[PDB]
């Protein structure tokens, strides 16, 4: 029963390092590669190396080389992969990936769930919530000026989900994050019934409720 | 039976395009990658290319991405490259070669063609054929050398032999050597005894095919 | 080094669709490669190794072909679930990505604007949000225009996943003004170009 | 493109010794798939190329046991244990790691022999070639070893450069020496000036330079 389990996410400063880990389990640690991969948001996948769990040795991607490191604990069959000297580029899920077979194999069969890891200049912020005035009509709300990622977004406290989106949060130029979220409704419940944002931001502990009206 | 064949030679005009032919066994063509490499005369040996020939899956050295082009003939077995733009400096030998296939080759270029010459001219000129003689103070009773001075010709190459092949032994025919004239010249001596110069008869015979020139020359004091 | 080219870079298919992409690994004599698919959020997937080969797991409609350096992996009678994008590898290598997504009819845009709270003047910014709502293609335009000021650089899109139900897409370009850039000024517009549009539409409100 | 450095260009070696060849790739040549595509080729005078040795050190079908190569990474050696007249030849490396695939320079094999010095000849110009107006003077050394001769044309005491143009044999496959030309190319204006014509040869073999020589007419 083959199991790779990496660290929680990260959030970093330009210059600094990260460690993330990777525990093996199911299989005998010393007998396959472990490599590194990772994936900036909404791009492609970007090997970064392996390293050989029963000698230590590696390969580093050329990208890489110089600021990245690849260890092993055989003991408690944990890769560690550290990526120094950080930069905004390397904002990106890392994921630990494992051979299907021994020695020099490619086909990563075997995958952690992924570690997030935040590079930004940015300080830990809440975000600022704006309602989304109606001119089927459209009610939502404005998360504005927000970092690190994620926050959430509900309407009514679950009461409200059909047509509703929460877009993708963008980043600005400011190094902060910003979305919307919005809902179509009917025209009849615009003066019955009220709409209220559950918007919340766990890292900065920022529960707040923005209430829509015309 | 062999693996790979390829033509003898070809003559080609600068500017022009000449396309090369190998021809592969069944055996070769399912299973082998096929490469092309040049070798100038007395240079050393350089990759061009090769070509799956199940899938015209092609690989070049970025120098002759333009130059090369790789295909092959399914029915035929045949695998091609054509030159483009020709030049002086694509006078070569290019050999064909196999590679095995699989997650990547595991042995090498485990065979190989005999290669095809490729002469790139501008012009044909045939050579003049001087005698080189032993003087008057020769040492008798010793041993002589005489030659042939085989000037001012264009392309190479010349073949030159001595009494119809009949001489060999001790035959040296020297390297071509380009002069500023932009023509080869070259020598082509063989050491006797000194009392044979009165009596044997010596003949250079010159053959310079590509202006299809037989010459031959005799040699006396 | 090795340069994998996968094509096409995004696919339309519908549900039941027989789906081929592909695959070509050039300045490389390897001929095995490996494909794998992601869905948001979750690591890749292995479909196929060695070329051909079928991962554990994976149905009988996923196959993978290999002659030389091309590759094909073929999926027969496409699934809903099978909507993703998918990846070719050679040793380090992976290819840009093909992104298989779900076609359907043509659906316009139900367009939307909303001027800044005044909550968010208090502040001391300005952000004028407009939507394009349950829409498809995903291909679309949006303009913003300033009093009849066709404005540029500083507004900022954001497209949201195709719809698992009904299939469409909805966009949020925010146009982010200064207070003072904003209050001095009249009349500003939201103007939006689709496929299922006859001619643009326009949505606008004076401040 | 990787890079590969062969060491020497030429390899003088007697028969019986060790040969030894060494190759460097610019960068790691070890694969991804864990293998180090290595080969060495030999190319012998007139023949196509023949695979010698794979994947660093293992001999292809029928290279006999005298042929050994040795490496890691970047750095390979070539060894021939007990050289024979037929490993004549030029020796290259190659590394197939790399797309594209690269061949080293190409280290000559020359089979060292006792000293032996030239026999030197000069020929004057044809009589028929004085007409179409140029004059060759041919200096023929026939049949030495080593390849290191010094050539020089006297044209009535009078030393000359950029007069002349040498040629020189590949090393005999049998009795492994060299022989080399020197002609001296000249107008007949310029030939029929000067009267004596030498050329004077520099080699270990001779005890001092020989002088060859004649007058013209
Ligand atoms: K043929
Ligand atoms: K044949
Ligand atoms: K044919």
């Known amino acids: 029963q083959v199991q790779l389990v990496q660290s929680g996410a990260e959030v970093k400063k330009p210059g600094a390092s990260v460690k993330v880990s990777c525990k093996a389990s199911?299989?005998?640690?010393?007998?396959?590669?472990m490599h590194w991969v990772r994936q900036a948001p909404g791009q492609g996948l970007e090997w970064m190396g392996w390293?050989?769990?029963?000698?230590?040795?590696?390969n580093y991607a050329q990208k890489f080389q110089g600021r990245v490191t690849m260890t092993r604990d055989t003991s408690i069959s944990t890769a560690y992969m550290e990526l120094s000297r950080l930069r905004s580029d390397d904002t990106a899920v890392y994921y630990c990936?494992?051979?299907?077979?021994?020695?020099?194999?490619?086909?990563?069969?075997?995958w952690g769930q992924g570690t997030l890891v935040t590079v930004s200049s940015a300080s830990t912020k809440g975000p600022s919530v704006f309602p989304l005035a109606p001119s089927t009509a459209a009610l939502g709300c404005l998360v504005k000026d927000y970092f690190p990622e994620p926050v959430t977004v509900s309407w009514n406290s679950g009461a409200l989900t059909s047509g509703v989106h929460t877009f993708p949060a963008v980043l600005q130029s400011s190094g902060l994050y910003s979305l919307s979220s919005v809902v179509t409704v009917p025209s009849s419940s615009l003066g019955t019934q009220t709409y209220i944002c559950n918007v919340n931001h766990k890292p900065s502990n920022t529960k707040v409720d923005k209430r829509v009206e015309p | 039976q062999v693996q790979l064949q390829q033509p003898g030679a070809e003559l080609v005009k600068p500017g022009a395009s000449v396309k090369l032919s190998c021809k592969a066994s069944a055996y070769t063509f399912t299973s082998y990658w096929i490469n092309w490499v040049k070798q100038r005369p007395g240079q050393g040996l350089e990759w061009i290319g090769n070509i799956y020939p199940g899938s015209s899956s092609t690989n070049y050295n970025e120098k002759f991405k333009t130059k090369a082009t790789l295909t092959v003939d399914r029915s035929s077995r045949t695998a091609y490259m054509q030159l483009s733009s020709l030049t002086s400096d694509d006078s070569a030998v290019y050999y064909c070669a196999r590679l095995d296939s699989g997650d990547w080759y595991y042995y090498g270029l485990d065979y190989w063609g005999q290669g095809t010459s490729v002469t790139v001219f501008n012009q044909i000129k045939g050579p003049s054929v001087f005698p080189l003689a032993p003087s008057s103070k020769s040492t008798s009773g010793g041993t002589a050398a005489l030659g042939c001075l085989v000037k001012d010709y264009f392309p190479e190459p010349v073949t030159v032999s001595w009494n119809s092949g009949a001489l060999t032994s001790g035959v040296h025919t020297f390297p071509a050597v380009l002069q500023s004239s932009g023509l080869y010249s070259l020598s082509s001596v063989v050491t006797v005894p000194s009392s044979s110069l009165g009596t044997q008869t010596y003949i250079c015979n010159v053959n310079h095919k590509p202006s299809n020139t037989k010459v031959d020359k005799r040699v006396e004091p | 080094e090795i340069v994998l080219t996968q094509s096409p870079a995004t696919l339309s298919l519908s549900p039941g669709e027989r789906a081929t992409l592909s695959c070509r690994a050039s300045?490389?004599?390897?001929?095995?490669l490996a494909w794998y698919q992601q869905k948001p959020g979750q690591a890749p997937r292995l479909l196929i190794y060695?070329?051909?080969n079928r991962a554990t797991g994976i149905p009988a409609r996923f196959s993978g072909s290999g002659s030389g350096t091309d590759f094909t992996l073929t999926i027969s009678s496409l699934e809903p679930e099978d909507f993703a994008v998918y990846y070719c590898?050679?040793?380090?290598?992976f290819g840009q990505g093909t992104k298989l997504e779900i076609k359907r009819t043509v659906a316009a845009p139900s367009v939307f604007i909303f001027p800044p709270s005044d909550e968010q003047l208090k502040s001391g910014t300005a952000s004028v949000v407009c939507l394009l709502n349950n829409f498809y293609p995903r291909e679309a335009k949006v303009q913003w225009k300033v009093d009849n000021a066709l404005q540029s650089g500083n507004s900022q899109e954001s497209v949201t996943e195709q719809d698992s139900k009904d299939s469409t897409y909805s966009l949020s370009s925010t146009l982010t003004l200064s207070k003072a850039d904003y209050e001095k000024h009249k009349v500003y517009a939201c103007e939006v170009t689709h496929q299922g549009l006859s001619s643009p539409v326009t949505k606008s409100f004076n401040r | 493109?990787?890079?590969?450095?062969?060491?020497?260009?030429?390899?003088?070696?007697?028969?019986?010794?060790?040969?030894?060849?060494?190759?460097?790739?610019?960068?790691?040549?070890?694969?991804?798939?864990?293998?180090?595509?290595?080969?060495?080729?030999?190319?012998?005078?007139?023949?196509?190329?023949?695979?010698?040795?794979?994947?660093?050190?293992?001999?292809?079908?029928?290279?006999?046991?005298?042929?050994?190569?040795?490496?890691?990474?970047?750095?390979?050696?070539?060894?021939?244990?007990?050289?024979?007249?037929?490993?004549?030849?030029?020796?290259?490396?190659?590394?197939?790691?790399?797309?594209?695939?690269?061949?080293?320079?190409?280290?000559?094999?020359?089979?060292?022999?006792?000293?032996?010095?030239?026999?030197?000849?000069?020929?004057?110009?044809?009589?028929?070639?004085?007409?179409?107006?140029?004059?060759?003077?041919?200096?023929?050394?026939?049949?030495?070893?080593?390849?290191?001769?010094?050539?020089?044309?006297?044209?009535?005491?009078?030393?000359?450069?950029?007069?002349?143009?040498?040629?020189?044999?590949?090393?005999?496959?049998?009795?492994?020496?060299?022989?080399?030309?020197?002609?001296?190319?000249?107008?007949?204006?310029?030939?029929?000036?000067?009267?004596?014509?030498?050329?004077?040869?520099?080699?270990?073999?001779?005890?001092?330079?020989?002088?060859?020589?004649?007058?013209?007419?």
């Open positions: 390293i050989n769990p029963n000698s230590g040795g590696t």
């Open positions: 199911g299989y005998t640690f010393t007998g396959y590669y």
């Open positions: 300045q490389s004599v390897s001929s095995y």
């Open positions: 060695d070329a051909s």
């Open positions: 990936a494992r051979g299907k077979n021994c020695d020099y194999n490619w086909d990563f069969q075997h």
């Open positions: 590898q050679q040793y380090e290598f």
